[PDB]
Amino acid sequence: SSRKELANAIRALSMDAVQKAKSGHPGAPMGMADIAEVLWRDFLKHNPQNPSWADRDRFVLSNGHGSMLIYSLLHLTGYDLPMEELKNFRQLHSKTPGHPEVGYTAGVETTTGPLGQGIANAVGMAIAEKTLAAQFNRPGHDIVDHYTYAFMGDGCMMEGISHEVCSLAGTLKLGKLIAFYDDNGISIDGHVEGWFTDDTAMRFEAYGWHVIRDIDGHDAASIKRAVEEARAVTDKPSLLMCKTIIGFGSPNKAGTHDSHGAPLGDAEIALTREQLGWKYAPFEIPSEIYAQWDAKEAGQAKESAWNEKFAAYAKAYPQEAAEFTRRMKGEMPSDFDAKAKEFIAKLQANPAKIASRKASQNAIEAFGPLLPEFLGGSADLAPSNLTLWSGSKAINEDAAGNYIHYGVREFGMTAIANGISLHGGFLPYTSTFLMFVEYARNAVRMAALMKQRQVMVYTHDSIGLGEDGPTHQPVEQVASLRVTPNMSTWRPCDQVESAVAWKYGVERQDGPTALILSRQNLAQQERTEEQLANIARGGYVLKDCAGQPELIFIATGSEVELAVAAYEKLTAEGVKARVVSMPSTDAFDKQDAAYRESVLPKAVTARVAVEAGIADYWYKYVGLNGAIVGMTTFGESAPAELLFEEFGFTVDNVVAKAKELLH
Amino acid sequence: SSRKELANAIRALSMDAVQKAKSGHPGAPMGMADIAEVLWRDFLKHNPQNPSWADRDRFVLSNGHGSMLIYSLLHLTGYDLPMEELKNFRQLHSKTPGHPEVGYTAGVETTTGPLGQGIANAVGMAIAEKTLAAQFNRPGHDIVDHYTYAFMGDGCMMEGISHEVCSLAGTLKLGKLIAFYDDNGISIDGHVEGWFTDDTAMRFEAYGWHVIRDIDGHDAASIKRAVEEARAVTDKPSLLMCKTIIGFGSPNKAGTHDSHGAPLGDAEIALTREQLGWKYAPFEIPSEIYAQWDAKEAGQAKESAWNEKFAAYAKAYPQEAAEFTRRMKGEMPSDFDAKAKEFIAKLQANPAKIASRKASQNAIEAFGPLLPEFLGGSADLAPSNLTLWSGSKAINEDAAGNYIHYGVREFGMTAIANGISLHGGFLPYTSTFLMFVEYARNAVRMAALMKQRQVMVYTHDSIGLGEDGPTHQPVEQVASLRVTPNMSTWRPCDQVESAVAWKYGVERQDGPTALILSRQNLAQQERTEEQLANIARGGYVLKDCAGQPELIFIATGSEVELAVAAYEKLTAEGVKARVVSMPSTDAFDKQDAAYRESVLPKAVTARVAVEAGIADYWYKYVGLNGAIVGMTTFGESAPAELLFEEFGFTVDNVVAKAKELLHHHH
Ligand SMILES: Cc1ncc(C[n+]2csc(CCOP(=O)(O)OP(=O)(O)O)c2C)c(N)n1
Ligand SMILES: Cc1ncc(C[n+]2csc(CCOP(=O)(O)OP(=O)(O)O)c2C)c(N)n1
Ligand SMILES: O=C[C@H](O)[C@H](O)[C@H](O)COP(=O)(O)O
Ligand SMILES: O=P(O)(O)OC[C@H]1O[C@@H](O)[C@H](O)[C@@H]1O
Numbered sequence A: 001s002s003r004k005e006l007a008n009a010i011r012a013l014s015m016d017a018v019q020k021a022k023s024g025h026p027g028a029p030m031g032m033a034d035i036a037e038v039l040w041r042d043f044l045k046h047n048p049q050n051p052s053w054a055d056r057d058r059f060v061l062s063n064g065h066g067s068m069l070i071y072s073l074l075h076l077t078g079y080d081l082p083m084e085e086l087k088n089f090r091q092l093h094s095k096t097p098g099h100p101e102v103g104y105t106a107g108v109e110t111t112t113g114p115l116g117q118g119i120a121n122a123v124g125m126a127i128a129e130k131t132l133a134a135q136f137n138r139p140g141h142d143i144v145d146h147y148t149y150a151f152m153g154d155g156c157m158m159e160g161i162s163h164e165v166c167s168l169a170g171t172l173k174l175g176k177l178i179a180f181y182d183d184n185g186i187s188i189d190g191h192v193e194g195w196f197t198d199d200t201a202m203r204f205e206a207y208g209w210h211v212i213r214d215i216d217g218h219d220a221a222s223i224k225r226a227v228e229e230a231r232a233v234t235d236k237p238s239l240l241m242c243k244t245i246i247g248f249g250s251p252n253k254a255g256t257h258d259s260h261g262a263p264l265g266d267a268e269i270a271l272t273r274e275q276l277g278w279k280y281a282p283f284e285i286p287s288e289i290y291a292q293w294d295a296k297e298a299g300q301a302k303e304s305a306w307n308e309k310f311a312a313y314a315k316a317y318p319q320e321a322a323e324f325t326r327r328m329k330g331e332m333p334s335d336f337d338a339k340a341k342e343f344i345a346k347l348q349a350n351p352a353k354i355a356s357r358k359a360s361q362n363a364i365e366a367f368g369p370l371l372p373e374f375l376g377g378s379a380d381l382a383p384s385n386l387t388l389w390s391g392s393k394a395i396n397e398d399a400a401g402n403y404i405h406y407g408v409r410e411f412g413m414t415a416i417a418n419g420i421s422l423h424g425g426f427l428p429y430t431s432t433f434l435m436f437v438e439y440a441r442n443a444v445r446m447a448a449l450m451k452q453r454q455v456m457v458y459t460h461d462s463i464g465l466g467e468d469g470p471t472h473q474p475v476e477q478v479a480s481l482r483v484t485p486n487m488s489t490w491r492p493c494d495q496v497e498s499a500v501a502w503k504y505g506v507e508r509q510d511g512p513t514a515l516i517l518s519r520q521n522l523a524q525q526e527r528t529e530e531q532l533a534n535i536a537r538g539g540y541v542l543k544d545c546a547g548q549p550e551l552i553f554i555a556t557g558s559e560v561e562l563a564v565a566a567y568e569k570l571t572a573e574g575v576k577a578r579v580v581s582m583p584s585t586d587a588f589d590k591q592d593a594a595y596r597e598s599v600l601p602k603a604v605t606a607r608v609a610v611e612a613g614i615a616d617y618w619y620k621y622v623g624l625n626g627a628i629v630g631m632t633t634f635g636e637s638a639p640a641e642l643l644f645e646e647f648g649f650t651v652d653n654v655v656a657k658a659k660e661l662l663h
Numbered sequence B: 001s002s003r004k005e006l007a008n009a010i011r012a013l014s015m016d017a018v019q020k021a022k023s024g025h026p027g028a029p030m031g032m033a034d035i036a037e038v039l040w041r042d043f044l045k046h047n048p049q050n051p052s053w054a055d056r057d058r059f060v061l062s063n064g065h066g067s068m069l070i071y072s073l074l075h076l077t078g079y080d081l082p083m084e085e086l087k088n089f090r091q092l093h094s095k096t097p098g099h100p101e102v103g104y105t106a107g108v109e110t111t112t113g114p115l116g117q118g119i120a121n122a123v124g125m126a127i128a129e130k131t132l133a134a135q136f137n138r139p140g141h142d143i144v145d146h147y148t149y150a151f152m153g154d155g156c157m158m159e160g161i162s163h164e165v166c167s168l169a170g171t172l173k174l175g176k177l178i179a180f181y182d183d184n185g186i187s188i189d190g191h192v193e194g195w196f197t198d199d200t201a202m203r204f205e206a207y208g209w210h211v212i213r214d215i216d217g218h219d220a221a222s223i224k225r226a227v228e229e230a231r232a233v234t235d236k237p238s239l240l241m242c243k244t245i246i247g248f249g250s251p252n253k254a255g256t257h258d259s260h261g262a263p264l265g266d267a268e269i270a271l272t273r274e275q276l277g278w279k280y281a282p283f284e285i286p287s288e289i290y291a292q293w294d295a296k297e298a299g300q301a302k303e304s305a306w307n308e309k310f311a312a313y314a315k316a317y318p319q320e321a322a323e324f325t326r327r328m329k330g331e332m333p334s335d336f337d338a339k340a341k342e343f344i345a346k347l348q349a350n351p352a353k354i355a356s357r358k359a360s361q362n363a364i365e366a367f368g369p370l371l372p373e374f375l376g377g378s379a380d381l382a383p384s385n386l387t388l389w390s391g392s393k394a395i396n397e398d399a400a401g402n403y404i405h406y407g408v409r410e411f412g413m414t415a416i417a418n419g420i421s422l423h424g425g426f427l428p429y430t431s432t433f434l435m436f437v438e439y440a441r442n443a444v445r446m447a448a449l450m451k452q453r454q455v456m457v458y459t460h461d462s463i464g465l466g467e468d469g470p471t472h473q474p475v476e477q478v479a480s481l482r483v484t485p486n487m488s489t490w491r492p493c494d495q496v497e498s499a500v501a502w503k504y505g506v507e508r509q510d511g512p513t514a515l516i517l518s519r520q521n522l523a524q525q526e527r528t529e530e531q532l533a534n535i536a537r538g539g540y541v542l543k544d545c546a547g548q549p550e551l552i553f554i555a556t557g558s559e560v561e562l563a564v565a566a567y568e569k570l571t572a573e574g575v576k577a578r579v580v581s582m583p584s585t586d587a588f589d590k591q592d593a594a595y596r597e598s599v600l601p602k603a604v605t606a607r608v609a610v611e612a613g614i615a616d617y618w619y620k621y622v623g624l625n626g627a628i629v630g631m632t633t634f635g636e637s638a639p640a641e642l643l644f645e646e647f648g649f650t651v652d653n654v655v656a657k658a659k660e661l662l663h664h665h666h
């Protein structure tokens, strides 16, 4: 069959599946089908039989609304995505959700839909490949060698996050990253010139990208030549400016916003078949077209050749090969648990009053020699977030390193890290001041949604940071993280809880972990063996009374010391008081009901929460008959000590609020 | 004095103020002092005696960590910011907080600190001036004519938001926007080349900006020539690449990251005085230097000339002048309250089962003729968010318009809108799908912090949007807004609550208002006159029983219909039930104790929250002995009706959970 006929199979499947669902986006799949046909059939190195092959090229659909494009590709090339799944596009529990999702659909590399994040993820995957290659490749043994291809549209180009990650991609000279820009001149509001006039090629040249202008996105020869040129440029990421017609094939909707985001309609589909000369019924693909699209045979040949290469590598470099396999699988070193526990025990036995940001650095230092998979960084706050350890090596200086200077790019940093986690081989950590999680907020959510392991190191967690004032002092940010599905959030009260939280973070297999860390010094709490072990349970009894408590303080982070001081005062008066330290609400919630009852007995309603963050969160644990010593306002610019006093984080106020309950 | 001496006054006040506070950022003020001296002394049109003068130039410090730069400028030029306040830099309740804050420091135009948002605000202020000029200027009466100047550094340049707002500023050909880039090669991690290598000039040329390269940021003549060039270019915003030395003056810390964000140290300050030839003690400025810095006489002259111009305008165009004054003050039309109430009453009397996104569009259509100050827009979702009304006119088409195609730029859009509200003359509304509030999240917080009036139109509020699936379906986003200080958040249950929320939003002078709106059709509820009035109280009794309820449903938005259905089932079975509609938790919380007690009596503990959003939020109103019919997971890609079924948003399930609750209580 002709290349245009092969590409037209994508057009037919896409418009038909959208029509059947009465929902979806036929424009981009129709506009990009010719580009996809060249990339997938001529260049993409992949095995449909094993979507997890370590050395496969990675493809990313950043314009993820065009989900039928990727489903057509996966089906046609022989992945485990039958026609019935395409016929169930956008239907409950199908393998063909409205935007592509990593994890159930074979071959989908990442979850897109939020514009701009796909390209960010791609930048992360290219960073991972370059770094893994530098770490593992040996003379005569290039076991890591793959491209990262991304499709993206006007929406991704307009988003700020594209500037963050494409800027950094240029700095890092990501020669194996190749992006195709679907330059179709249309967005939802109509012709883009009213709101988007960038000389996008010039913009990308400013980033140090290799840019190929004026590609006819509907001509196989033009596209193929451009990809060849891009692959020949090894020291710069490449952008291919692909001029396309959105909804290509539709006489009445091609080139219009009408084709973007709704079914074409039965009549228009009939006209499209006529224009394309496509003779097949909906969901009919002839054997000749499958024969030219199918990649099972080539895929298995390529992967088997790689397996043989890896076997030879394992002979010459057995320890390295074992590390590669362990790291690609995301498995932890077998003695990590024992070694981390030893560190935790040492801290408990050797008290230090330090900021939890420093306790965090200390955990990185302890874990560093144990976790060569670390690929960490900070958004231009290394000396403040304390993300460097003695073994940190910046990848802009040493390609085989383990540290990234992300610059002032919180959103890009976090979505890049999502790419890194998705790639395999690494354990990313990222960092900024907690307030600026708000800049990265949707990428944090995406890590949770995609069930990705990433440790998010968020320092300067409250009014305790002092003089920088209300634009920097978090109040409501922790609460937002706590109510995020599949997020783990830890606000350690001292260096011991900080190490436990770090351990929990690196050992998570199925989601991210945010560490909520102080600028200011935190007192260490004394713990029994049982209490020490129970830190990992997220909430535990820190100070207690004999028999049923009359009063329970629930405190986190920097406020545990305050709660303990109130407890001592009330205990001396003869109140049966308890202090619960609650470093992680999510880990506590996951405990069995007997454990939860032992910490927060259901019959004890006199509960006082204490946390320098938004009060409203705490009704979850204090109910309607408790008290909350929290924040209800923005902060103020002043020294920390005076702020805590001003906002009622005092022994007198905590005691007074508790006494109010006991009547 | 020489220009360098005058600029050194800023250097001295800045390093000394930071030293006394033992906290702050001397680097940027010291690096940008010569630029500030030229801009402020030679170009800036302002009156220190009236920081609210309608036609003043606007200045924005986007690299807001260098706060002592602006405090030095305001003090030296004669604003109401005494030396005692500079001595109280970074101290509780001073007029000199660590990052500048609009509101309680004379002459500060916006609150910065979050990098990138300053330049966004500046773009908003420039859009406001251009639009206001187009709307109000008349032949021989150019009553609107001022520049917007912004300072920004490497941090602002790296941030994605700079791309969003500078791209759009290029499209809109904002000839009176002039930005100065503090090109000093240093950020917190060190020399920027390790992580920041853009050809920034080429980037801004790609945006359609006029760029002036290689300006010696420490040479007044060079700076002045560059400003004159930027002012001569009337059809593009300008970027002046100013090469500076961070911490200029410090022998040991200039040009180093060490000067960025900590006090220089007393020894180093002594050496800096010696290098700069600055002889005066900390917080000492001689009369002769004040005489050269002071702007009171020039300022008064310029404002008086403008007042004469405005008086002539008022004579020739009295209605237009009255509108200009009203709009600059942010006052509402005198008949707006009455007309809006008439609209609301009409809706209650004429039920329509429509999506609250459509109800929102209908309110825009009703208010549009009444509020010529509207400057609304959507981030490339006009046909989905339903932000256009019949009188909308895009400002890229007609500069005198009232609508902005923001493109796919949620964060930039919202921070631009903050600039628009800060400028005066307009009432901005912005819009995207609720999920993508997460892209704009800190700009939303900044509107709340800055006490700004902006209506935020957030559609597609839940799993009710259907097939687009979990990357689009909000779950936890409403809760996030509800816990934000000074945020108002409305999740209207029908077209009537939608109109009330819109009225509340436009009339809210001291903070923003987010509207949480459905894709799918919402049932109109029956209301008495009293209930209709009570919508604005945020939470109110919608359905009730005789005597103390044994069960209270609390519901919002699309789920009120479900709660009412459950209430009907239970009532028919002889259960004593109540339904509370809670369109706004923040408004409800602001009601007095007696009113809140009347709605959610403390005696009644069997409370069931119903909302297609994260369940954990609702413990606030249901306590530990209630029930919550909410979401606890991400969504799924499927038709909305199947999703509501899947996730337990059914009459049978709500009734079952309510009965299960009552069984446990009994
Ligand atoms: C962050 C974000 N904002 C908004 C949307 C809604 N949206 C989806 S596509 C689009 C604009 C059109 O973008 P483009 O890539 O040019 O679409 P195409 O040409 O492929 O049809 C928008 C606003 C989104 N998915 N993500
Ligand atoms: C959104 C955001 N992220 C991080 C910070 C912390 N921060 C303040 S300045 C800076 C980097 C230095 O930027 P630059 O403007 O080049 O500083 P300068 O040369 O004026 O000292 C950072 C990361 C912030 N204020 N806002
Ligand atoms: O992500 C935005 C998509 O393009 C929309 O899913 C699509 O345009 C449908 O819009 P609506 O929800 O108004 O039917
Ligand atoms: O002392 P910390 O809080 O680490 O940092 C002080 C300031 O220096 C930089 O980090 C930032 O600019 C911050 O505002």
Ligand SMILES: [Ca+2]
Pocket: A153, A154, A155, A182, A184, A185, A186, A187
């Ligand atoms: Ca497009």
Ligand SMILES: [Ca+2]
Pocket: B153, B154, B155, B182, B184, B185, B186, B187
């Ligand atoms: Ca800098």
